[PDB]
Amino acid sequence: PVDVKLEFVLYRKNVTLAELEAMGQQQLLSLPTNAELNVEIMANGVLLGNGELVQMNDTLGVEIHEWL
Amino acid sequence: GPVDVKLEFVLYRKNVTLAELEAMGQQQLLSLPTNAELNVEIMANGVLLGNGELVQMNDTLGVEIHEWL
Ligand SMILES: [Ca+2]
Ligand SMILES: [Ca+2]
């Protein structure tokens, strides 16, 4: 099979084209509180699961709270 | 509609095989590559707009922009 496009998504939302332009004027973007508690694992547009950011000994990790 | 944009802040993305995805699904704690956090990608309708670095701010996480495309 062909490869699938896997993403670990820290935050997602719908915004308007105007808000998208506004965002580009910023140098530091705040994410909503607890975005780190809802990391979404997605592939080819399908939600696979969600989890939480963890600082491990040498990297960041994602602790899975649910595989769908 | 056309005014609507799907915005994503992506910590890590990769083209993976079905077998690799299967193996991932067996895990409870997934390690990300070293410094994935240095390349948080900002996507709009699946297209890369910019990238930055994950920062712990006072009340939330933030993304420090390093490049807008
Ligand atoms: Ca926790
Ligand atoms: Ca935590």
Author numbering:
A (entry chain B): 2 to 69
B (entry chain A): 1 to 69
Question: What did the original publication write about this model?
Answer:
Our structures suggest a partial model for the subtype-specific assembly of the T3SS sorting platforms: the heterotypic interaction between SPOA domains within a given T3SS subtype functions as an adaptor for ATPase and its regulator through interaction with the APAR peptide.
Preliminary bioinformatic analyses suggested the presence of two putative SPOA domains in the carboxy-terminal half of SpaO, which we denote SPOA1 and SPOA2. The Salmonella SPOA2 homodimer superposes on its Yersinia and Pseudomonas homologues with 2.24 and 3.05 Å root mean squared deviation (r.m.s.d.), respectively. Indeed, SPOA1,2 is sufficient to co-affinity purify OrgB–InvC.
